[PDB]
Amino acid sequence: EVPLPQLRAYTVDASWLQPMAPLQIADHTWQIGTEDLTALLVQTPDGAVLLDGGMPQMASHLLDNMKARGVTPRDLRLILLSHAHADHAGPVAELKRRTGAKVAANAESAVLLARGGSDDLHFGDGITYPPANADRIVMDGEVITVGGIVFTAHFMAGHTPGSTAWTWTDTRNGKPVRIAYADSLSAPGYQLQGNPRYPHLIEDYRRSFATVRALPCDVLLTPHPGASNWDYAAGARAGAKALTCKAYADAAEQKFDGQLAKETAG
Amino acid sequence: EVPLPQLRAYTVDASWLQPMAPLQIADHTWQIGTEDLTALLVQTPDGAVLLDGGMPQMASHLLDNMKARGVTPRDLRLILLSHAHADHAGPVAELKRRTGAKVAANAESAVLLARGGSDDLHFGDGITYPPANADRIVMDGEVITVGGIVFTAHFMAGHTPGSTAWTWTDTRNGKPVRIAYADSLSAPGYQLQGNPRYPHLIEDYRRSFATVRALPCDVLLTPHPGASNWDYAAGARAGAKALTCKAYADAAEQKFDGQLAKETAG
Amino acid sequence: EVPLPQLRAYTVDASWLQPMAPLQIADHTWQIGTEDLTALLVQTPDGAVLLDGGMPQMASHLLDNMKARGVTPRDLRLILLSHAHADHAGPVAELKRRTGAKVAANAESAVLLARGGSDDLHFGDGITYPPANADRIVMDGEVITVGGIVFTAHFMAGHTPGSTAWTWTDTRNGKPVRIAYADSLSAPGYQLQGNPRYPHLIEDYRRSFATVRALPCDVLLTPHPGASNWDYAAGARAGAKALTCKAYADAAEQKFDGQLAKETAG
Amino acid sequence: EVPLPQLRAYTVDASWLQPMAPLQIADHTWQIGTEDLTALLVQTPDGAVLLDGGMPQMASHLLDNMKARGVTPRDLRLILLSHAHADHAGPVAELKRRTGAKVAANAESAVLLARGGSDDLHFGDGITYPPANADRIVMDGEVITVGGIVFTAHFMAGHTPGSTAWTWTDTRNGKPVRIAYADSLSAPGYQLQGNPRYPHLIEDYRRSFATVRALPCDVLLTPHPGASNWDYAAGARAGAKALTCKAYADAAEQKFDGQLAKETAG
Numbered sequence A, B, C, D: 001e002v003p004l005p006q007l008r009a010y011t012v013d014a015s016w017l018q019p020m021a022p023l024q025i026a027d028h029t030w031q032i033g034t035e036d037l038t039a040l041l042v043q044t045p046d047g048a049v050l051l052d053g054g055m056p057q058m059a060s061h062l063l064d065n066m067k068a069r070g071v072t073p074r075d076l077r078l079i080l081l082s083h084a085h086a087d088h089a090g091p092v093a094e095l096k097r098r099t100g101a102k103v104a105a106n107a108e109s110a111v112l113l114a115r116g117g118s119d120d121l122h123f124g125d126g127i128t129y130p131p132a133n134a135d136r137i138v139m140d141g142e143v144i145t146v147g148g149i150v151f152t153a154h155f156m157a158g159h160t161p162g163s164t165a166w167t168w169t170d171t172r173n174g175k176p177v178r179i180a181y182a183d184s185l186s187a188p189g190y191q192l193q194g195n196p197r198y199p200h201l202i203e204d205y206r207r208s209f210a211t212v213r214a215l216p217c218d219v220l221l222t223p224h225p226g227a228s229n230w231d232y233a234a235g236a237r238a239g240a241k242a243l244t245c246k247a248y249a250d251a252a253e254q255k256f257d258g259q260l261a262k263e264t265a266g
C-alpha cells in the first residue's frame, strides 16, 4: 500500500548553478551570477543595484562577487527583478536579511514574491522559494535613480503577470551604452488559450513582443543568457553574438506562434 | 511658537454616511450601503457576495442590512471591490474579522488594500483605513462563481491602478439583466500629465473609457450613485435616470479632457 | 569544477505520508491525517475546525476525509495549529484557497507561517512550505468557540516560539472528555545554550513542561502520535497506550536534560 | 434623521507635537523628537539607529534633526520600537520609504505594526497609522549591533503584547553609561481583569515591572518623557530629575494596583 509522494526538489541544469567570477558588461555593470543565470550588479558612487539573484542557493556567491567588486553588504541599496520565479528571485529574501538592500517591484511581482512563488498561475506550488516583501511598488514607465544611473521599468507581462524589462544607460570606451535587461518571453508548458487563471495571456504576450522590440537597446541581456545569445563563459567574446532586442522579440514571437499552433492541435 | 499640525480626519458629506434600508436592484442584487455610497449584496443559494463596503464606519450597518436580507455573517462568502480607497473599501478589514468573507482582488488593489490606502499615488497618507489582506488574486477577465452567479473582472485602471468593473447576470421580471458595476473614472486633484508615480496614467484612462463603453450593461451601477445618475433615496424611481455604460464613459472622458486642458493651462 | 549544490527536498519517513481513513477520538473529534502525522477534525453543528494539516502534499487527502465525514469545503470554518513547521502546517495555504477556512494563531506562529517556515531560528531555509496569512491573532489563554466547542490556547514556547497546546471538551459514552492537543517538545539538532537567535530557549522549555503537565487532560494527542504513544494504525486500540499529559511532559523534560548534558560535553 | 458619525482624528496635546532641536543624552545618543515624545538617535561610525519616531506627522522633522546631526537618509540603518502605537511608531512606514532604514521588532510588535495599529486589543480601530513591515524579528534577550553599539531587547509585555525595553551602553565624560529605554507601563482605559482578548494581562504586567526594575540602568528614558521625570525643554537640566528604573517600575506598579482596585469597584 501506497504513501503520498515525497516532495520533489526544484533541480536545474548544473550550468545554472556554476559560479563564475564577475564579467564586465560596461563601465559600471557586471554579470555576477552563474554561467547560465544572470544577476547584474550596477555600481554607482552612491551604492550598488542588483538586478536578479538567480537560484535560492546563490546568495553567498553573489555576496562574494560583490565583495570582489568593492561592494560590501551595506553598499547594496536596491534589488530589481525581471520576474519573481525561483531561478531569478530565489535568494532575494536572504539577500535582504544580509545586506542593506531594499526591493522595488511592480504590484504583480510583489504579490508573487510575497508568496514565495506559490500559487503560480501555471506551476501551482511546484516551484517555490523563500518569500520576500517589496519596499517600493513601481508603475509602468517609472524611473528609479541610484548614484545617477536611471533605471526605467517597462512592463512586459506574459511569462509572469509582473514580468518587467529594466533599461539604463551606462558608458563604455567613452560612449553611452543603452542597456536593456529584457525579461523572459517563454511560456514553458503553459496553457495559452482560454486559460481561466490568465484570460488575456495571448494579448499580453503580443503587446510584450512589441514593447521589447521598441526598447532602447544598444546591448540586450536576458535572465537566461542563452535566450539573447550571450555565453558568459566565453570571456572577451561573451556578448559578441548577442541578439538585438528586435531579434529577441521576433524569435520569441515565432516560438510563441508555433506553441499556439501545437496547442490547438494537441 | 508652533506645533506640527494635528492629524486631520477623513470627513465626507453627510449623505455618504446616511444609512438606508436595502434597495432591490434585481432578483438577487441589493443596494445595502448608504444614500450616497454603493455597497451591493448579491444573495445566492450558496452564500452571499458583497461588492464594496463604503466608509470604514459602515461595517455594523452593512451587517444589519445583511441580517434583514437573511444573510448571517457565516453566509457572507466573498467581498469584491471597485477600488481600494477608504470610501469604498473602508470596512473590509472589520467585515473579514466579523464574517466568513474572503476577499478577491487584483494585484494592484490587493497591494493598496494591504497598506490601508497609505502611500497612495496621489493622496499620499492623507486618506487611510484599516489594512486588509486579499485571499485570492484575480487577473483581467477572470471569473468568480458563487451559487451560480458568475462575476467577471474587467480591469479599468486609472482612478487607481487596480480599478475594476465587475459584471454579472441576474434576473428581473423573468428576464436576464446584465448588471455592470463600473468603477469610478474621476481624477480628483490628480496630476495627469508627466506624473512620475503614474507615467502611463492618461493612456490607462483612455483604455478604461473604451472598456467601460463596451461592457455588457443592461443596468449600470457605480461606487458613487450620482456618477451614474442613480438616486438611492428615490425608491421605485431610484434607477429610472441611470446612465448607460456608454453615456457614463463618454461623460467621464469629456470631463477628463477638460481637466487635461485645465492642467496644461494651470 | 564544481556547481553549487542542488536544492534538497524535504523528505520524510513513508509512514508520515501514509493516508488513513478517519479515526474517531470522541463524539465530534476525528484523526483525519496520515498514520504518523496528526490532523484533527472537530465537527460541530456550526461548521468544522481543523487542528493541523500535516505535510504540504496532504491537502487533497484531508479534503477527501472531510467529505467522508460530511464536511464540505464551505463547512470548514477554522484552522488552528500546534506549530508552523512544514510537517504540521504544510498544506494550510492550499486549504485556505480551497475551503472557507480562516486561520487563528498567535503572533509568533503567524509570523513564521507568513514566511512559509523560512528564516527558521534553527533550520534556516532548509524546511519551507507555501506561506499563509493568519486571519485572527490569539493571545495566551484566549478562547475560540465554534458550534459550542470551546478551544483554549495554552502557549508552550520552545520547539518554536509560537508552539501552542489547544484544549477542548468533547463527549464520549455520555461523559465529558477533556482533550489536550499538546505541541511537540523536541529540540531536534537545536543549539540549546547561548543561542543568539533564542536566548531564553531553556527557560521557555522549562515553563512549557510545567504548562503541559497542568493541562486539562483526560486524553492527550500530539502532532507526532508516537510522542504520546498513540498508534493510529491500531484501530480500536489506537489510543490504549497513550501517555497522560504529566507523563508526556516528564518524558520530554528528561530527554531535554539529556540533550543539555550532551551539548555541554560536545 | 441621522448619519453615521464622521471619523475622528487622533489628536494629542500640543506639546507632543512641538518640535525641538536635538538634545544630547550621551556621546552618541540624542533626543530628536518633540518636547513630549521621545525619538532617540544613536549615531555610530557604521550608521545610525532610531528608537521610536513619535506621531505620524513627525517624519520630516526627524529627518531634519538627523541632517543637523550629520545623518543623511542613507546613513539611517535601523529603526527599533518601544511599542507599535500611533504616537510612537507613527512615521515608521514613511521613514522606511525615505531612508535606508530597516525595522527590527518582536513578533507581537511586527504584527501590530503591519496592521497599522488596527484591531488593537483595547483601542479597536480608534487609533491607527500607516502600516509597516518588519525586516527582522527579534526574540527576548537578543542583541543587535550597529557600529559597535550593542542593543539588547528586554520584552516587557503589558501596555502592548510586544512592548520592549531596549538597553545599550554609551559613554559620557569618559565613562560608560548604561542607557535603558523602557517602554510604557500605563494601561489607559484598559479592562485589566478577565479581558478575553488578553487573559494573562495582569501576570504580564507584574512580570514586566520586575523586568524593568532589574534593567542595567544608569540612565532611564521612556517614550513619554514625563513618565520617567524627564523634561526635554529644560536644557542642561532636562534629565536632572529622571527616575531610576527601580522607581519607574515601582510607580507604575502602584498606579496599576490602584487601577485594579478601581476596576473591581466600578
Ligand SMILES: C[C@@H]1[C@H]([C@H](C(=O)O)[C@@H](C)O)N=C(C(=O)O)[C@H]1SC1CN(C2=NCCS2)C1
Residues within 6 Å of the ligand: A085, A086, A087, A127, A184, A185, A186, A188, A223, A224, A225, A226, A227
Ligand atoms: C522552464 C524555464 C525556467 C523556469 C521559469 O522561470 O519559467 C523556472 C521556474 O525553472 N526559466 C525559464 C525562463 O524563460 O525564464 C523557462 S524557459 C528555459 C530557458 N531556456 C533556454 N533555451 C535556450 C536558451 S535559454 C528554456
Ligand SMILES: C[C@@H]1[C@H]([C@H](C(=O)O)[C@@H](C)O)N=C(C(=O)O)[C@H]1SC1CN(C2=NCCS2)C1
Residues within 6 Å of the ligand: B085, B086, B087, B127, B184, B185, B186, B188, B223, B224, B225, B226, B227
Ligand atoms: C474625491 C472623491 C472620492 C475620493 C476617491 O475615492 O477618490 C475619496 C478618497 O474621498 N471618491 C471619488 C470617486 O470617484 O470614487 C472622488 S470624485 C467625487 C464623487 N463625485 C460626484 N459628483 C457628482 C456625482 S458623484 C465627486
Ligand SMILES: C[C@@H]1[C@H]([C@H](C(=O)O)[C@@H](C)O)N=C(C(=O)O)[C@H]1SC1CN(C2=NCCS2)C1
Residues within 6 Å of the ligand: C085, C086, C087, C127, C184, C185, C186, C188, C223, C224, C225, C226, C227
Ligand atoms: C525532526 C522532527 C520533525 C521536524 C520538526 O517539526 O521539528 C520537521 C521539520 O521535520 N518534527 C518533530 C516534532 O517534534 O514535531 C521533530 S522530532 C521527531 C518526531 N519523533 C518521534 N520519535 C518517536 C515518537 S515521534 C522524532
Ligand SMILES: C[C@@H]1[C@H]([C@H](C(=O)O)[C@@H](C)O)N=C(C(=O)O)[C@H]1SC1CN(C2=NCCS2)C1
Residues within 6 Å of the ligand: D085, D086, D087, D127, D184, D185, D186, D188, D223, D224, D225, D226, D227
Ligand atoms: C493614552 C496615552 C498614550 C496612548 C498609548 O500609546 O497608549 C496613545 C495611543 O494615545 N500613550 C500612553 C503611553 O503610556 O504610551 C498612554 S498614558 C499617557 C502618557 N501620560 C503621562 N502622564 C504623566 C507623564 S506621561 C499619560
Ligand SMILES: [Zn+2]
Residues within 6 Å of the ligand: A083, A085, A159, A184
Ligand atoms: Zn520564469
Ligand SMILES: [Zn+2]
Residues within 6 Å of the ligand: A085, A087, A088, A184, A223, A224
Ligand atoms: Zn527562468
Ligand SMILES: [Zn+2]
Residues within 6 Å of the ligand: B083, B085, B159, B184
Ligand atoms: Zn477613489
Ligand SMILES: [Zn+2]
Residues within 6 Å of the ligand: B085, B087, B088, B184, B223, B224
Ligand atoms: Zn469615492
Ligand SMILES: [Zn+2]
Residues within 6 Å of the ligand: C083, C085, C159, C184
Ligand atoms: Zn517542528
Ligand SMILES: [Zn+2]
Residues within 6 Å of the ligand: C085, C087, C088, C184, C223, C224
Ligand atoms: Zn514535526
Ligand SMILES: [Zn+2]
Residues within 6 Å of the ligand: D083, D085, D159, D184
Ligand atoms: Zn501605547
Ligand SMILES: [Zn+2]
Residues within 6 Å of the ligand: D085, D087, D088, D184, D223, D224
Ligand atoms: Zn504613548
